[PDB]
Symmetry: C3
Subunit: 452 residues, 3 copies
């Protein structure tokens, strides 16, 4: 669908509107199990190319079992810290409780899908993915038993190593990630299992369809937690996201440093909005995600994690149209560092050009089409493919969409130098103002002293 971007020359910022939300508000926990069989010994005394292949494969299996038993014994800093897998670990604590795994085992004996009531009070979906027990006991061992371990068919060796392959890779991922893997691999959960788990979760059909349409993102926001291998069953807990907020209006704010352009080399003053990031409407409030890469965009849907969010009033949006509005204190940073740089937006690029820096926008068939004068400016991605700032060449996003240039006098011109508080990092419109008011009284007080 159409995406609309607005550029504000007054504040040297850009807002990309039209995106839709898909916020991860919670976690759903599922128990994934594989059935194992304890092999005491292979009494295979006859050795040949086939026996050594099946035996070494068996050694890899018994070694994987042993390995797991050992395993089982701007802004952004203002966000709140969480425990990503605190939910899954809680399930581990119950599965570690006496006789709890057996309850799961009895439910998964006849079918591969069951809801089990855990001892605490929680009903959880349980899933038997691989049945290695019944394979090793009644498909492999009889062939071995019948011909006294001289296996006539090479096919058994090829197939057996394939059935064991999934187990060895699951072990590797857990063994290299300290029992916690992310994203959820295809070895962790096959697509057929994942889609079926999506289909069986207690959520709306709108949510089921969303997760099934973007199974790739679901995988990336999930965890796999190794849990327990006891009583002929190994089980790990998969922790899937649940998206409670879908299809709410959402927009992205891009900002770039705004500096004065004076003839004197070192006497310039800068101002930068620090409220950059994604903003989604939610239940009368606004979820603000300061960290840039906390969200992944697919078409028009933004898949985000609320864990990296702040909850702000709806009045936050006024900072885009009126940064000095009297209802929300817009967050800004100050500097005297007039360094040229560029900000690539969704439908264009912001260019803050200062000093003698070379700033250029180019078309692939046309070359340079615009040379930026000093100040903060903006260009649409329509006729433009490339942007050049200094020695850094930026490629622009090539997404068709509506652009809007909002004229205005740069806010940095509204402050008188020499009285500018030039070392504020997480300040605001009013916060800088009062520090100015404190500096102007200190100047009156020093001049009132020169008077005598």
């Amino acid at each position: 669908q159409n995406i609309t971007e607005e550029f504000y020359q007054s504040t040297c910022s850009a807002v990309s509107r039209g995106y839709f939300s898909a916020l991860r508000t919670g976690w759903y926990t599922s128990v994934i199990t594989i059935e194992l069989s304890n092999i005491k010994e292979t009494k295979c005394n006859g050795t040949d190319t086939k026996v050594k292949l099946i035996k070494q494969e068996l050694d890899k299996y018994k070694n994987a079992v042993t390995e797991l038993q050992l395993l089982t014994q701007f802004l952004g800093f203002l966000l709140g810290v969480g425990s990503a897998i605190a939910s899954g670990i809680a399930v581990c604590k119950v599965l570690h409780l006496e006789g709890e795994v057996n309850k799961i085992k009895n439910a998964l004996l006849s079918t591969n899908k069951a809801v089990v009531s855990l001892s605490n009070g929680v009903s959880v979906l349980t899933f038997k993915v691989l049945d290695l027990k019944s394979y090793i006991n009644n498909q492999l061992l009889p062939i071995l038993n019948q011909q006294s371990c001289r296996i006539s068919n090479i096919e058994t060796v090829i197939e057996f190593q394939q059935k064991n392959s999934r187990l060895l890779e699951i072990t590797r991922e857990f063994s290299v990630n300290a029992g916690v893997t992310t994203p959820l691999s295809t070895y962790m959960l096959t697509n057929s299992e994942l889609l079926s788990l999506i289909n069986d979760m207690p959520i709306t059909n709108d949510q089921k369809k969303l997760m099934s349409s973007n199974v790739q993102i679901v995988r990336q926001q999930s965890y796999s937690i190794m849990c327990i291998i006891k009583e002929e069953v190994l089980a790990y807990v998969v922790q899937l996201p649940i998206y409670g907020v879908i299809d709410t209006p959402c927009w992205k704010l891009h900002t770039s440093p705004l500096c004065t352009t004076n003839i004197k080399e070192g006497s310039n003053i800068c101002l930068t909005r620090t409220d950059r990031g994604w903003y989604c409407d939610n239940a009368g409030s606004v979820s603000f995600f300061p960290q840039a890469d906390t969200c992944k965009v697919q078409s028009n849907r933004v898949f985000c994690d609320t864990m990296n969010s702040l909850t702000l009033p709806s009045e936050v949006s006024l900072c885009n149209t009126d940064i000095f509005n009297s209802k929300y204190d817009c967050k800004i940073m100050t500097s005297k560092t007039d360094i040229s740089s560029s900000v690539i937006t969704s439908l264009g690029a912001i260019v803050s050009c200062y000093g003698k820096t070379k700033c250029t926008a180019s078309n692939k068939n046309r070359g340079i089409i615009k040379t930026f004068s000093n100040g903060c400016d903006y260009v649409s991605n329509k006729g433009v493919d490339t942007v050049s700032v200094g020695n850094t060449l930026y490629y622009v996003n090539k997404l068709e969409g509506k652009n809007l240039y909002v004229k205005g006098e740069p806010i940095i011109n509204y402050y008188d130098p020499l009285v500018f508080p030039s070392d504020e990092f997480d300040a605001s419109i009013s916060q800088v103002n009062e520090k100015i008011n404190q500096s102007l009284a200190f100047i009156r007080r020093s001049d009132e002293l020169l008077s005598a």
Copy 2:
């Protein structure tokens, strides 16, 4: 058995009772694979079997050449290190003339040897795969007999299985610039690691700890590719050495502490910047600021001293007395009245300000606590979930004793309009003197009035 303490005065939490396992040094070991380089594949007869062994042979012949090509808050004060300077030094010695022969000849009869390098250093060496003796005496003879027509498909399957470990090791190096971390199981199997652990020059206390938590050891290890020369492939495994064990370790969590005034803009905030891990070590405290630099297993904290500063034991007074005259407690200031929550080991700190809705809930009963404006704390026993605005936080489910220590929030001791509200790495005494310097200009400017 971990005890947590919450200080309402400073809106912080301290979890006491953890034990240490600090990586104080590095041990370097040389892991080798003996290879034989195939001169040429002259298979002239074409068949589905010949094409299978030839491509399998080519993949091996490619890995050797491929690897051979490869062979030619706070925190800002933390000193910078060189993680693999130890491994790089060991690599550099193996490159010396006639040095590989010393390595090769020692591992010719056994798979474990201590080799004295020309400089002076004895290193543990390990021959894991002997592909040379496989290729020369079992595979190459089979191939030559019928001009590459293998009657038993088992041979190609055995070769591809025998060849698998080499190719997988190559692939990790091929995507990670010759330096892998954590240490994969293809680099060093669990069986080899415990055996290499058992042979390291450490206490039995150190061996048992590492052997019981080989998973964490893997995450703090490096694999450094070095050389393929004279039909021998070798890479250096750099394992951590835990010189400091079982000393006390505690965690300090911090969250912004602001006033809760009815007036929209007149609130002031204060936050302790000393968040992180604290372990006693040699009479001092080892401080690790960033959360993800340490990994916890049960009651032990595995950390790397390279990401630490060394602080006096008096740092602990900031938890019990932020105004103590023996250590200058580190603080940041703001006027940013933002609500947020920090999940502790045994609970959650909740900073609730403005019109934000802050709630603590249980899974079986729903909402159980409604937070009033200010910084407060709830234990994880009867509480399962914590919600701050649009953010749903799950709490840790670890049983343990908690302690709510009443005290007046420190932010109330300050009068606004005179509060310096832009300090990032300042301290109680730094803020005090900055007010004292502003009040001296306040006293003296009115005193000069006549």
Copy 3:
């Protein structure tokens, strides 16, 4: 490989000179294709041991194919980029109706072709694996003739290897949301990469660099999966282009500098904030503040210009004259009197303060020098290890020329009580005006009494 390091005691900073540049200035995009054949359904019955392996192998192929159709729908002052804006632009062209057909028709006769896309870009296209003609004319006839009884095991093993690369590429794309980095060997083999290196519009000197350090190339590349339609699978590979090579490049290490006075809590600190890599580029200096954004091989520094700022050449004066009147050297101020050490390319910087024990030791001799309070530096020649408090730092063992440049510590030139001690990204000139404004208020107030 001759590297010279200079340590400046006045400013507690170190410059490692002699390194050369290799800046990623542009992007090259190539489209790699695999020809597929979609089976309506394998209508073979799944029971016997021979059928179950080939039939299951066929299902793993058909599921990976189906999966792809589902999927196919300092430092803070830096500027933000779009890393794959170039690659996404190319992929977007392939989604237009009937656009893929131009690709297919060109790669019918050769495995390498330059195709005219309908929109605007000419891209190299590459058919690596041909699964179509194998499935259509070698496997399925063998399978169909004997009613899924594959009597000869050799055919199925060849298939699973021929099928392997697709599943591995599919598996990687399935874990990285269609965008992978670094570029794996399943994405692009060395044989393919070196041949693709040879066709890029660069000089032979640039070509030779990329082929000699193919490992770094992989780490600065992306693979973008985007389309599987009309019996063709294609993804865009985005390789770096190093337009600026062999320019002088140097690394600046800095460590906090505090006074060493007897009073425990009364101390003042100062730190140069302009740490990072500096390479000459187009008469200016390309500055990389982030340390791990560059990878070092011998004397070549592979960096990405996208995370860099462009600075005037006068930046180098901050190493030689921190008070120079031509460039405003960046510094931070504090009262956080904490001891620490900085490992350089050819040695170690040690900021030793308070009652901390600071020591540099040799492996064969033990402790050789005990550091007094202040910021100091020792060469990697006679020194093997350095210890500060409970933190053990290993020094790099690279031979190279070192230079201890004596000078009075800059922190001593300032009188406390007028020192602005909470500046995070301030400068020489910024501190001076704040001192003069506070000292003029002290001059005029005391001159009145």
